Amino acid sequence: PKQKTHRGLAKRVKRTGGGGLKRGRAFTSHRFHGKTKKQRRQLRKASMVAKGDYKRIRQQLARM
Amino acid sequence: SNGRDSESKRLGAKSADGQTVTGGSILYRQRGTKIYPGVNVGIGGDDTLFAKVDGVVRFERKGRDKKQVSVYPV
Amino acid sequence: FEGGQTPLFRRLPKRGFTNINRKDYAVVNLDTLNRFEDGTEVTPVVLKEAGIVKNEKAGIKVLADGELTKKLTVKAAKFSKSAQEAIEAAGGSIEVI
RNA sequence: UACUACCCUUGUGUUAUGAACCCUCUAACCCGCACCACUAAUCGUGGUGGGAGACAGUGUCAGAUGGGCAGUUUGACUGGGGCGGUCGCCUCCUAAAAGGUAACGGAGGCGCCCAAAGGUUCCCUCAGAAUGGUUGGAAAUCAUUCGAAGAGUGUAAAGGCAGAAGGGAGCUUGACUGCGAGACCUACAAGUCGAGCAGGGACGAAAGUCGGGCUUAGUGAUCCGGUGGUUCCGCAUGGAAGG
RNA sequence: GUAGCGAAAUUCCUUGUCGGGUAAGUUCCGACCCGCACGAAAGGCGUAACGAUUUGGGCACUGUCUCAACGAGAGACUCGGUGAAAUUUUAGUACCUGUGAAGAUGCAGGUUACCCGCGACAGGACGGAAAGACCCCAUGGAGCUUUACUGUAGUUUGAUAU
RNA sequence: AAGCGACUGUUUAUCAAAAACACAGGUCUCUGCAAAAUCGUAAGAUGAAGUAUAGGGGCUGACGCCUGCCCGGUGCUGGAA
RNA sequence: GGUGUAGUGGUAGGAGAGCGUUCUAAGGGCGUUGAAGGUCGAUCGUGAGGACGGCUGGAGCGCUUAGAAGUGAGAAUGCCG
RNA sequence: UAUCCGGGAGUCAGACUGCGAGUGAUAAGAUCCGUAGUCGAAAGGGAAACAGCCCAGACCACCAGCUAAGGUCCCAAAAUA
RNA sequence: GGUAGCGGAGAAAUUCCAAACGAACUUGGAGAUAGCUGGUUCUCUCCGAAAUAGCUUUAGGGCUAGCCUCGGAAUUGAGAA
RNA sequence: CAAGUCAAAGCUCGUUAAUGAGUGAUGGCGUGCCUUUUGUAGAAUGAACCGGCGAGUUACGAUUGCAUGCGAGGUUAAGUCGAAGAGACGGAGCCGCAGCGAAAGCGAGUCUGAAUAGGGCGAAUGAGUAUGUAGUCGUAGACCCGAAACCAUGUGAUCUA
RNA sequence: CCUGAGUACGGCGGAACACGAGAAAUUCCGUCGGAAUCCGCGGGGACCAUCCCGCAAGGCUAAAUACUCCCUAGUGACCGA
Numbered sequence A: 001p002k003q004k005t006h007r008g009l010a011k012r013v014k015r016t017g018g019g020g021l022k023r024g025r026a027f028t029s030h031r032f033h034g035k036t037k038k039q040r041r042q043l044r045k046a047s048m049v050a051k052g053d054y055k056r057i058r059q060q061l062a063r064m
Numbered sequence B: 001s002n003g004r005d006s007e008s009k010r011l012g013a014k015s016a017d018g019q020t021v022t023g024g025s026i027l028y029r030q031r032g033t034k035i036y037p038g039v040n041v042g043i044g045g046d047d048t049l050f051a052k053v054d055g056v057v058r059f060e061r062k063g064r065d066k067k068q069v070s071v072y073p074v
Numbered sequence C: 001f002e003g004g005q006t007p008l009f010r011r012l013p014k015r016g017f018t019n020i021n022r023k024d025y026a027v028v029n030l031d032t033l034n035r036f037e038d039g040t041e042v043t044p045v046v047l048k049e050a051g052i053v054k055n056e057k058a059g060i061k062v063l064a065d066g067e068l069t070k071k072l073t074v075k076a077a078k079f080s081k082s083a084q085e086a087i088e089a090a091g092g093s094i095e096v097i
Numbered sequence D: 001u002a003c004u005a006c007c008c009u010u011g012u013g014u015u016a017u018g019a020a021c022c023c024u025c026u027a028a029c030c031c032g033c034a035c036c037a038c039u040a041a042u043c044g045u046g047g048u049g050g051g052a053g054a055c056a057g058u059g060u061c062a063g064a065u066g067g068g069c070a071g072u073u074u075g076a077c078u079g080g081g082g083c084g085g086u087c088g089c090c091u092c093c094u095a096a097a098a099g100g101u102a103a104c105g106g107a108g109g110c111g112c113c114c115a116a117a118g119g120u121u122c123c124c125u126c127a128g129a130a131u132g133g134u135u136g137g138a139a140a141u142c143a144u145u146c147g148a149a150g151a152g153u154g155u156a157a158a159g160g161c162a163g164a165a166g167g168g169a170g171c172u173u174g175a176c177u178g179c180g181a182g183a184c185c186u187a188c189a190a191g192u193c194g195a196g197c198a199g200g201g202a203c204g205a206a207a208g209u210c211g212g213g214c215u216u217a218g219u220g221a222u223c224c225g226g227u228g229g230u231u232c233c234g235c236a237u238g239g240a241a242g243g
Numbered sequence E: 001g002u003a004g005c006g007a008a009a010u011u012c013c014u015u016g017u018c019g020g021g022u023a024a025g026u027u028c029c030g031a032c033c034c035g036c037a038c039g040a041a042a043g044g045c046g047u048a049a050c051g052a053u054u055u056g057g058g059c060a061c062u063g064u065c066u067c068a069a070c071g072a073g074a075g076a077c078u079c080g081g082u083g084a085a086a087u088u089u090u091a092g093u094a095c096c097u098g099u100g101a102a103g104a105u106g107c108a109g110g111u112u113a114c115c116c117g118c119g120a121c122a123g124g125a126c127g128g129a130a131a132g133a134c135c136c137c138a139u140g141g142a143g144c145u146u147u148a149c150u151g152u153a154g155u156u157u158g159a160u161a162u
Numbered sequence F: 001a002a003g004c005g006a007c008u009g010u011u012u013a014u015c016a017a018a019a020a021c022a023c024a025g026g027u028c029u030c031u032g033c034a035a036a037a038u039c040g041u042a043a044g045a046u047g048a049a050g051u052a053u054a055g056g057g058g059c060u061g062a063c064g065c066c067u068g069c070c071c072g073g074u075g076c077u078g079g080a081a
Numbered sequence G: 001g002g003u004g005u006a007g008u009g010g011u012a013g014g015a016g017a018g019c020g021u022u023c024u025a026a027g028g029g030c031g032u033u034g035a036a037g038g039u040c041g042a043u044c045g046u047g048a049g050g051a052c053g054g055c056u057g058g059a060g061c062g063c064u065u066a067g068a069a070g071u072g073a074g075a076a077u078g079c080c081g
Numbered sequence H: 001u002a003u004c005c006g007g008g009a010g011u012c013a014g015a016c017u018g019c020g021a022g023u024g025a026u027a028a029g030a031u032c033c034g035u036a037g038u039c040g041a042a043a044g045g046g047a048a049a050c051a052g053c054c055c056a057g058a059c060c061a062c063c064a065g066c067u068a069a070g071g072u073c074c075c076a077a078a079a080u081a
Numbered sequence I: 001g002g003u004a005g006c007g008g009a010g011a012a013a014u015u016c017c018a019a020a021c022g023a024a025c026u027u028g029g030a031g032a033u034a035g036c037u038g039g040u041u042c043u044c045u046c047c048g049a050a051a052u053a054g055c056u057u058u059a060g061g062g063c064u065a066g067c068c069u070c071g072g073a074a075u076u077g078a079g080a081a
Numbered sequence J: 001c002a003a004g005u006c007a008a009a010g011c012u013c014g015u016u017a018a019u020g021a022g023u024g025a026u027g028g029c030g031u032g033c034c035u036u037u038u039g040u041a042g043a044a045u046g047a048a049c050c051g052g053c054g055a056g057u058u059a060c061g062a063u064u065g066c067a068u069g070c071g072a073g074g075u076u077a078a079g080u081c082g083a084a085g086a087g088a089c090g091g092a093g094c095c096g097c098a099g100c101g102a103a104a105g106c107g108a109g110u111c112u113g114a115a116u117a118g119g120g121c122g123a124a125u126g127a128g129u130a131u132g133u134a135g136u137c138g139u140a141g142a143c144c145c146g147a148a149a150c151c152a153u154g155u156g157a158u159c160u161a
Numbered sequence K: 001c002c003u004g005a006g007u008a009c010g011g012c013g014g015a016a017c018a019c020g021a022g023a024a025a026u027u028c029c030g031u032c033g034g035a036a037u038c039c040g041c042g043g044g045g046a047c048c049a050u051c052c053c054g055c056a057a058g059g060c061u062a063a064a065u066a067c068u069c070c071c072u073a074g075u076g077a078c079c080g081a
């Protein structure tokens, strides 16, 4: 049997050209009155997956 | 009871005298202006000092008993 | 698995969807076509026979990264505007299948 | 105003229909009722009587009840465990003059408030003591002097502030939008600061300040739903559903 | 909370107080009732007979004991025959003091001790037997309870069909 | 002489013989006969080849004197606008 | 291949070099003038280990290169004898 | 020897000694931190014996020498200096 | 002869149901699962740790970072004293 | 005296003949092996002894390194022919060469944004692919043993109720 | 004129379809209700219109595919008590 792809990751990341992963941000759903606007505008900007985290999830989302 | 405390926040100097540094850097975190701003230095909402342009950090006495930070470029 | 700690996938949000009617085109970047003899007719059939394009996914799209140096009667599904400019400037002729 | 019709509300009737409900019927169903036959049979199947009767029973669907039965749950830290207490966040000490640093070590706070307690421009400087003066005292308020902060700073403590961040009066709403080089902290997720650019503004003559408050707490993922907008998609097409 | 009972199969305090029994009685019997925390079919109070029932006292009786002594027989013991088991890292397997995973046959220092056995005892080998049953832990199990959760067989009510 | 249980019986085969169980007796409750209850998918069966002086279930437990107050709560029964 | 300098304690652990066993393909060679195995030797190699002899034994086995693995035991209150 | 990239791990029970503090009874081979060392994972020499103290880091051989801490009357090498 | 395990029988003790019954025995799912203990076999060489932070229905487990090893790479040589 | 080691007298033999073999009085030093532990000589665990047996394997996939072939082209799968073969055929498909964005869509640019702004992700910097091999991971019992237990058939009342 | 009626379909309850009611097409079971038929009917993933494709509710149908108690001929870098 071949690998199973973690679909919860396949719905939550995206491959770049260098193989790295794009990701949405947290603290961006429902509770904004507690957050300044700098946080909100800086969190609507995506970011990239960490080194040690990609080390942990690459086997899951190997090809995707 | 008494058993609790907060995350220690990492105040104090972050750039050293005689040290070239980038613009927008941070030189001295603080609560209250234990050191004032000076040349080419600003101050944030939390009284944190930051160099507006490049240059060497220089700390100076602002007269008798208050301190200053300055950034003289090259 | 992070030991019961909330995993990275779960602490992040799902984003987007997939368009079932998506048109993904096979790309030819204008540095290839320096191969073919000037004046000829480039087609998906030609590109496949040469082996340049093996997967005509939705149609050939032509894009302009490299420098063109020939007259060519190229034809495809879609062209980019810079590719149109470069071809028509070299002296070729754009068509659309 | 008579009279003709078009007629309209209201409530009487005929007829046809639809439901609900009570009684009556027997012909379905039923009888661990009797008799006859199959038959030597307390079975059963039929037949004849009698009884009940469109109920019951059975099927489907639904509501209440249901430890009768079943599958499961029933935190951690901890000078054993348990109770007490604690779990998230902020401040100080411990913390050993960078930073960091533990204990069921010592002390306290937070889960908000403010439409001015913000911004800008202009102006001002406090606490207490002495002296005197009416009710008015130990002490309100008035006046002079002394007065370097011994006050105040929305709210804890620390740091800091009298070139004010403290106080007062005008004009406003920058408690803006898109962003953001670069740094700090950081396992990750996050958090913090941020010059500067652009748009469109506030105040001010102008310089220039303004992306909340004096600085640090006032908060919590994703999933899932809700609201508004959208130039996004829309299972052959147009829409729609739904994203 | 009545009758009735009450330091009780119930009374902690408590060896309660008083009396009897004993030279001496935390037990026992009878009264008192500050009933920690009796009580009326979870029955209360009483009750002849019954009991391999529990408790205390007395008489007789005795080796239970004071304090052991003797005898008999089976085994043990010697010989002949026959012939296991548990256990077992190797072993030429002393003592004191001390040390040391904190309690030493084995390390140290000192002392004592010719070699090999037989019968006896049982202080140690933290002896053997048994992966502690007390304790804690496991995001273990099983049985059981329930106004824990979620369900369900049945029970019941209704609608509909026959 | 005292306690418990009235008694004869039964009981943890292999650590508990008992003051525990049962017992006759008492009381409450249900059940009208295709009973009620129970086994079982249902047929079918026990109950009973019985019929409220019978049967099932709960509690107490010979005999004697007794068995007090509480229906607010939880259940049950009945009722009904 | 040599000279010099410096170094070479080691658990978990990482890396690299190997010895040995069984089998296979090829090459080559040794065995009734006595194979393997067994046993004793005072032998060689840095180690895993490798030869040569003596006795036993009686028919298959080494050596070189490469390959494939049921490839190496001292403990499992391990199993069988 | 630091950094960046990538492969593979193991480790999340630590102990003592000295110095700096807390808890403690300024007691504990106690507990919890910091700091340095050692052990762990380190043999050797001394401390009688003695992981954790003092000296010192085993690649091997030598019937060679100089020293460390600690020691020099005998056990037991060295001065009855 | 009858009652058979989601059970039966039980003068009722968690009691008996073929020498251990809070749910018999046997076969199969089945090599159940085990963050738990025990074990895991030849050699040499190079290098060589940690017992810490954070989070964890987490605390004797795990994940990331920290500490180790191996390969590559480049850089105004940053590293250590 | 964890039973040896080192030194060594004496005695007896004579080798894979070389700083020989065996024994050993006597003296010095020296608390087994494993596991698990901060730490075990351990009075913590396991082993009576001997011999045999007995534990990281394979299949399919992923990734990294090493090697080979080819190279911005590298490669076939199934199936057919054919020694249970190699090999040929088979280009369907797979990876890479172009990415960015939720997507429309644009394209060495794209997205955000009013924006030639700035910023993110990418390109100009470039190399991958097929096979083998080894390390590692995943799915399968996955390293070996070891539970109490759960479920579904069946067998049992010759014991006992 | 005919072209498969208690049928398709719908409601309720459940299943299978990769698809756990979800926006849930399609298929099937139970129950209840309940069509037209050539200008007709079903599908194209709620659904409506257009277009396209097909014509259920009646039946059969070899081959390629799976497996070996067995028989014959055999093969093995499978075992060798």
Ligand SMILES: [K+]
Pocket (backbone or CB within 6 Å): E006, E007, E033
């Ligand atoms: K009394």
Ligand SMILES: [K+]
Pocket (backbone or CB within 6 Å): E010, E037
């Ligand atoms: K009492």
Ligand SMILES: [K+]
Pocket (backbone or CB within 6 Å): E122, E123
């Ligand atoms: K003894």
Ligand SMILES: [K+]
Pocket (backbone or CB within 6 Å): none
């Ligand atoms: K349970």
Ligand SMILES: [K+]
Pocket (backbone or CB within 6 Å): F071
């Ligand atoms: K009542």
Ligand SMILES: [K+]
Pocket (backbone or CB within 6 Å): G073
């Ligand atoms: K073996």
Ligand SMILES: [K+]
Pocket (backbone or CB within 6 Å): none
């Ligand atoms: K060391």
Ligand SMILES: [K+]
Pocket (backbone or CB within 6 Å): none
């Ligand atoms: K000796």
Ligand SMILES: [K+]
Pocket (backbone or CB within 6 Å): none
């Ligand atoms: K590879």
Ligand SMILES: [K+]
Pocket (backbone or CB within 6 Å): none
């Ligand atoms: K290559």
Ligand SMILES: [K+]
Pocket (backbone or CB within 6 Å): K024
């Ligand atoms: K459906």
Ligand SMILES: [Mg+2]
Pocket (backbone or CB within 6 Å): A028, A029
């Ligand atoms: Mg949102």
Ligand SMILES: [Mg+2]
Pocket (backbone or CB within 6 Å): B045, B046
């Ligand atoms: Mg601020």
Ligand SMILES: [Mg+2]
Pocket (backbone or CB within 6 Å): C004
């Ligand atoms: Mg949690």
Ligand SMILES: [Mg+2]
Pocket (backbone or CB within 6 Å): D032, F034
């Ligand atoms: Mg009857």
Ligand SMILES: [Mg+2]
Pocket (backbone or CB within 6 Å): none
């Ligand atoms: Mg239950």
